[PDB]
Amino acid sequence: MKTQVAIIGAGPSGLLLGQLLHKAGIDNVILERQTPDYVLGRIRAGVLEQGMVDLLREAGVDRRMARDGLVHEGVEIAFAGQRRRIDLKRLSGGKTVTVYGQTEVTRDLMEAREACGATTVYQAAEVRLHDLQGERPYVTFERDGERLRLDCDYIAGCDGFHGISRQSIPAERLKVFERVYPFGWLGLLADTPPVSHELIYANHPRGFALCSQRSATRSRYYVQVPLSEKVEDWSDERFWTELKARLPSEVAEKLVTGPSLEKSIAPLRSFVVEPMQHGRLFLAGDAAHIVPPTGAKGLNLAASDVSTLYRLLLKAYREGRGELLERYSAICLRRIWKAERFSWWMTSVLHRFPDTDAFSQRIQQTELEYYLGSEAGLATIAENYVGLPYEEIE
Amino acid sequence: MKTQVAIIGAGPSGLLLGQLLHKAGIDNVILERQTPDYVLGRIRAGVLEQGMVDLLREAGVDRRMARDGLVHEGVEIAFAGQRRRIDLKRLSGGKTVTVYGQTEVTRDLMEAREACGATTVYQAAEVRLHDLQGERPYVTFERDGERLRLDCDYIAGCDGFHGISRQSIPAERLKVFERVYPFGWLGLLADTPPVSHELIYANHPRGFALCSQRSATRSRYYVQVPLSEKVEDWSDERFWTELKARLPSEVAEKLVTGPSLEKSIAPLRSFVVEPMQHGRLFLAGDAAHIVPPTGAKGLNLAASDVSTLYRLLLKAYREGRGELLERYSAICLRRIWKAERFSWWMTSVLHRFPDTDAFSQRIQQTELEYYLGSEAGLATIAENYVGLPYEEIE
Ligand SMILES: Cc1cc2nc3c(=O)[nH]c(=O)nc-3n(C[C@H](O)[C@H](O)[C@H](O)COP(=O)(O)OP(=O)(O)OC[C@H]3O[C@@H](n4cnc5c(N)ncnc54)[C@H](O)[C@@H]3O)c2cc1C
Ligand SMILES: Cc1cc2nc3c(=O)[nH]c(=O)nc-3n(C[C@H](O)[C@H](O)[C@H](O)COP(=O)(O)OP(=O)(O)OC[C@H]3O[C@@H](n4cnc5c(N)ncnc54)[C@H](O)[C@@H]3O)c2cc1C
Numbered sequence A, B: 001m002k003t004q005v006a007i008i009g010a011g012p013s014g015l016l017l018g019q020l021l022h023k024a025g026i027d028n029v030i031l032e033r034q035t036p037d038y039v040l041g042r043i044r045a046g047v048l049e050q051g052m053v054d055l056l057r058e059a060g061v062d063r064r065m066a067r068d069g070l071v072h073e074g075v076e077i078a079f080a081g082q083r084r085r086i087d088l089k090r091l092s093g094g095k096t097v098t099v100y101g102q103t104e105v106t107r108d109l110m111e112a113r114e115a116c117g118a119t120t121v122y123q124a125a126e127v128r129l130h131d132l133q134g135e136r137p138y139v140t141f142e143r144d145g146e147r148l149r150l151d152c153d154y155i156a157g158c159d160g161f162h163g164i165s166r167q168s169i170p171a172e173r174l175k176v177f178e179r180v181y182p183f184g185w186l187g188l189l190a191d192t193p194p195v196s197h198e199l200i201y202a203n204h205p206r207g208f209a210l211c212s213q214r215s216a217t218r219s220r221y222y223v224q225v226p227l228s229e230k231v232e233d234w235s236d237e238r239f240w241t242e243l244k245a246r247l248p249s250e251v252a253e254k255l256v257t258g259p260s261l262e263k264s265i266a267p268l269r270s271f272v273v274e275p276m277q278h279g280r281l282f283l284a285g286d287a288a289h290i291v292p293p294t295g296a297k298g299l300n301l302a303a304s305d306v307s308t309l310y311r312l313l314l315k316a317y318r319e320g321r322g323e324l325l326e327r328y329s330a331i332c333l334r335r336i337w338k339a340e341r342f343s344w345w346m347t348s349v350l351h352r353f354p355d356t357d358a359f360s361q362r363i364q365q366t367e368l369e370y371y372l373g374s375e376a377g378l379a380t381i382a383e384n385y386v387g388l389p390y391e392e393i394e
């Protein structure tokens, strides 16, 4: 079996990269450990930057998003009995963000790939990467008992945090940067109208709460929760009562509750690996970095890694400029670190930390008061929130 | 002995408040533990906000400052082999800061007070405050062996961090917020021309370094140093060698060195007390709060506490509106916390902290890169640096 670019992982990164590549004439095969249904079961992201929206258009998979996606021009932050609206559009010079679930984006990409007839092998078990520094790397996997080999020119590791690709780079070549937060997010998806037309991030003494949405009749809520929590300990009723206790009274009063369609706990963490490549293997998305959910940057950073990898590969195949691929890590890391800095800042000002001294609590509240009260403070949040510009390369 | 307002402390806070009060017809007496010469020996501050410059004019003690003070429109921040200039004037909408030593300001105030003939008692030993909640509070002190009593309507504690005034408020009425940093600043004053016409704050792997000045022929330099350091362990030559190792090569090459006129180590700390008053006692300046030197806010916050206390007292005496004095703490604390937040931020991004993990070092460098590279980031530094506006009261 032979292709030009082998892609490990059929989550959004792999599918998006594969679609862009296919449309430009660069053959690619995607290998995925799970089944289509398992992948489609992950709820995850809801907020997309303008850059990600443009990439989807370039891949030609934007019909449903243009119809069903909700364009947001602002977002609210509630703390100490007050709600402040950050006008993203005004403060960032006209940019906005789009709410369209990750599940939907993934569904759109999968349908698009099937229609073009590109190769995707699900239940590709025990994927192994070989001869990463040779001129002819290859991938081996198992499909129903038999071990098959796929030959390629390049390999893009789009296999998330627990993927095989990052594990295939000699540990000594990698530099790992990681921070584990002492809390997680308990999320609940419900077929109920959202409490507001814009998102509400809330810093409350009991902990963080976030009011989000998927559509006009589907909501997504989150509440900060200790790492010791087990989802079976949170009945729908306990969740709604908790959510209500963390929101401003006028917001909690008009909240329409309902049975959960999905309920799960996601731990918060920051993780960056440098560089993001080795030989003919290039890491993209969660395989190379994790950002806490607070800033809505994860899927958005995956998009920029992908936009960068695709353009460099195009240059390599179309223009014979294979040497430009060495710049991949340098280009992506500049954006990754600024997004990590923002996600980290959001996380530190919106959440309640264990054993915080009086001074730090006061500084936390003052950070909010300053950034939300100053025109310059507001603009730093807004420009970071809509997403810093992609770099052009070369 | 009787007066209207008793002032404990003849540092800048007490002298400035006393001058403003005298000029408006409100009699006041200042009690100081030390001698004029001891007070004049403290080097301390060099940077003044525009608000402090205007207050000095209002007190009529600005002749020498208008002649000798240096107006700065920018400041540099050096990190990772690069120097970035923050144009304060442009980014803050026209404000600047003035470099005029604290020693000089204090000298100007002392001469001004003597000329007007207002009362100042130096070597006032063992000052004690009494009947703080009565309608007739009083102060007792000792002058050459005999204990004297001073009767007054109000008492302004302008006695710094180690003063008697804050200690006179029942501890249970106070809420203390404090952070101790694991380092201090070793400062050196020299009769040498400064290395630059604007200040240079430097984040270097070896630690923080700051290049300041007092005039065209007098410089003030600082280098971060562990708390275990003793000044006798730092010869002038060791200091210059250390300073040079922390600055960009092109800056270290043109540095004119020379023997020190003063050398001392100041520990870094944050401290705020709430409220800032009790009965007829009002705390101002270092007596109520300490901010690390990094943001040049200490003397500047003392000025705003003083501007606020003076205007409220004027209202009380001239207009019989004694009830407005209850708003003192609320008004001052709003400004104090934002300045504390800024001083804290500056301190955390410019200094090298003990046992910092890889992630935090990278976040530190990224904070700099973001704030110094974004027009909105630059503006948050600049507006905070020149000093946020004073509140108007009532
Ligand atoms: C609570 C939550 C909220 C979030 N909210 C947002 C938000 O609003 N906005 C935003 O920008 N980001 C957000 N994110 C982040 C976003 O979900 C991720 O960054 C995104 O899923 C990254 O996609 P990916 O394709 O790189 O990896 P993944 O989605 O993890 O997909 C990787 C795929 O690789 C497959 N795979 C793994 N191992 C192998 C193997 N060995 N062989 C073959 N295939 C393999 C996996 O099965 C999976 O299909 C959120 C995440 C969470 C958890
Ligand atoms: C290294 C350094 C650099 C700084 N740099 C800057 C800068 O550039 N800009 C800026 O804004 N700030 C800066 N500051 C801060 C600034 O120096 C202080 O905030 C300022 O001195 C506050 O003045 P004050 O009058 O409140 O107190 P002080 O200057 O401490 O004076 C208090 C006075 O009260 C007297 N006193 C004490 N106890 C008694 C008693 N029991 N009875 C009677 N009298 C008593 C003392 O002797 C002293 O004279 C710096 C400080 C340091 C140490």
Ligand SMILES: Nc1ccc(C(=O)O)cc1
Residues within 6 Å of the ligand: A044, A045, A046, A047, A212, A213, A220, A293, A294, A295, A296
């Ligand atoms: N920051 C975030 C905002 C929204 C969501 C979500 O809608 O799922 C997740 C994270």
Ligand SMILES: Nc1ccc(C(=O)O)cc1
Residues within 6 Å of the ligand: B044, B045, B046, B047, B212, B213, B220, B293, B294, B295, B296
């Ligand atoms: N931030 C500071 C800037 C300058 C000085 C000083 O000149 O003494 C002190 C602190």
